[PDB]
Write a protein that binds this ligand. Structure first.
Ligand code: COA
Ligand code: COA
Ligand code: COA
Lengths: 237, 237, 237
């Protein structure tokens, strides 16, 4: 067998995650989202979004925008717990970290003050932070101050996963692989089976900050936001 | 950002759960239950159950009754492990804690000697313990001695979750959101697709007390009990 | 209530698992596999496989063979992390432990150098190691040196589970209950709903060794291998 020392990114990520689990009470709430309406909006909007904003329109900014709005309407999730002083801090800014798969390991660059950004500014920030993280061109400020994380677990086809949150953060939302499924729809009391583009949306939360019912209300706001798919003015094409 | 000290319920719940994970070997077994027959029984029985027993008939007492019977036929699950003496204690009483979402945080009031109660007495005990927990009118004895916990994770629409068990308890059963799904049914070798009211029933267990095959046998007894839906004499209308 | 001391198998298994979670960063990636083609191959091959190799042909050796090939093409998964020296060791041999449910508790006997075995030799090794583990006739060498574990969580009907990996191992793959499901198939752009024999394939991995994208690539190789079901020359009937 052969041995090699890991780089500092993998060494620090591993140590931070081993420690994270020992100082928090993590659970993974499982929710699902019907992404069919967003998939149709995305298909027709991709050429116009590429021409006006210079980036490829993916599902991730839809999830990030819905999460940012939900972190503002559920400020109890955009919060941190201090086990020594037994105090909760509800953060004014929404600093969303984006998990980026890089050749050197996982990096989670932060979109600071994401509550002040438009949908296109979020899409451009994801592309910019990911390109710089993959080229290992991030400033130290780019990895500090996260209040929440969104991880694209579906990039390598995972149906779901149990993402690890890292205190002081209280939640991490996963955007699992969007797959066609046989699901029940109802219209005027008529239950029927449709083929819909669904994805699991696991949400790992720390019971020190968020209880199970709070996690449920939080993902219900995001689920309803994405399923309604009222993003035409957000796309601003 | 703003800071406030958490109440004693949230402070103690958080600390007990952080510690629980460090002194146990928790896994979450995933099972599903076809609740359609119970849903039909419940719909027709609700007016008569409200008139005779004074409570609204929900799915929770069906799960609690099936769990109590299964804790009596699987006494290895109604048990506790002592890591110092390397001893297992199989408890004579079935003291089922019910997770209640309250304005002050999660409370888990205990139905002591639940193996001695009728189905209506269990339904009335859930309503009574929940009302008192929400009004913070519980006696100290009401929160002690639990041998098992049942948590209604479906109250805020969760498909599933990974509930945290708290030693000395060895299992916690979740009753996730009952949703209409496209599922396969078989009759005389004819596989067909039906619309059924299904729910995931996650079961978190401590490998110190219950192994994976034991968890499977335990949830199979409960799954079969609920799917058969022979609760007419239990409803006693 | 009654108390009895647990045997050494259950005492050591429990302690090793409590410790395993505290010194690793475990996540459970969720994947699914369409086992219908393997189920059809297995049904027609069982009489000939029993006559030539002397064992009953089950799904488990298909999963083990696909996992062994994937541990050779993904050598980053057949690896161990040393948190003190911050070094990764990629193991030359694939020593697959098989979780066996025994009357005395869980035992995980190891198939050493599984990369050097034929599909029938793997099927015969599972039967041999399981029979000896159930009769508690294992040599000490039979439980040492595992680089990966495969656990048949579906034996007692579990839809899925979150198996606990034990360092220095970096992954544990679960073969959950194969159940008939309503799933979408596509042929020349025609989406349609079929009844397929599916199973969840949870994969618990240590973020100290394997990141989420690596876990996804690893299970995608296994998923594609089993779904293609090109096992005729492997069966060698
Ligand atoms: C930086 C990153 C998050 C950007 O994600 P993104 O905005 O979706 O962009 P990508 O360039 O990777 O997307 C590639 C394509 O796959 C699609 N896609 C990405 N994730 C998807 C998912 N979960 N389900 C379905 N389609 C998805 C995108 O819409 C895009 O489609 P298109 O080419 O048809 O327009 C991503 O590259 C990445 O690193 N993902 C891995 C995150 C990670 O490591 N998480 C840890 C757990 S795996
Ligand atoms: C105390 C408590 C458990 C009682 O549960 P209950 O017996 O189902 O009673 P509720 O009054 O809450 O039920 C409201 C209605 O929703 C239904 N319902 C409740 N849980 C359900 C579920 N999992 N799936 C579908 N329907 C459900 C009930 O049947 C009832 O329906 P009806 O009005 O048509 O008769 C509940 O109020 C509660 O606190 N739940 C949250 C538990 C918790 O915090 N768990 C932690 C993880 S979220
Ligand atoms: C040793 C062991 C792994 C062998 O598994 P195996 O090769 O599938 O063999 P078994 O004799 O147990 O299989 C019995 C039958 O069920 C089938 N079966 C087993 N697992 C199955 C699954 N996940 N889904 C569907 N069918 C399955 C087999 O194909 C066989 O079918 P057949 O009689 O029609 O030919 C198994 O006996 C065992 O101990 N399983 C439990 C493992 C465990 O404890 N894991 C911990 C988490 S539960």
């Amino acid at each position: 067998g052969t041995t090699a020392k890991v780089n500092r990114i993998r060494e620090i990520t591993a140590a931070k995650m081993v420690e994270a689990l020992q100082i928090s009470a993590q659970l993974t709430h499982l929710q699902e989202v019907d992404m069919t309406k967003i998939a149709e909006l995305r298909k027709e909007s991709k050429p116009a979004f590429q021409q006006k904003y210079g980036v490829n329109l993916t599902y991730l900014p839809f999830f990030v925008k819905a999460a940012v709005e939900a972190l503002v309407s559920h400020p109890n999730v955009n919060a941190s717990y201090n086990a020594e002083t037994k105090e909760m801090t509800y953060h004014a800014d929404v600093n969303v970290a984006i998990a980026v798969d890089t050749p050197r390991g996982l990096l989670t660059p932060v979109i600071h003050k994401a509550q002040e950004l438009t949908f296109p500014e979020i899409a451009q920030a994801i592309v910019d932070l990911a390109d710089r993280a993959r080229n290992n061109k991030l400033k130290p400020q780019d990895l500090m101050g996260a209040t929440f994380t969104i991880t694209n677990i579906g990039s390598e086809g995972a149906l779901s996963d149990t993402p690890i949150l890292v205190p002081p953060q209280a939640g991490i939302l996963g955007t699992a692989a969007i797959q066609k499924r046989a699901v029940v729809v109802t219209e005027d009391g008529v239950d029927a089976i449709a083929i819909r583009q669904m994805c699991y949306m696991p949400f790992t939360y720390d019971h020190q900050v968020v209880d199970g019912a709070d996690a449920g209300r939080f993902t219900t706001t995001i689920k309803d936001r994405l399923e309604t798919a009222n993003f035409a003015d957000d796309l601003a094409l």
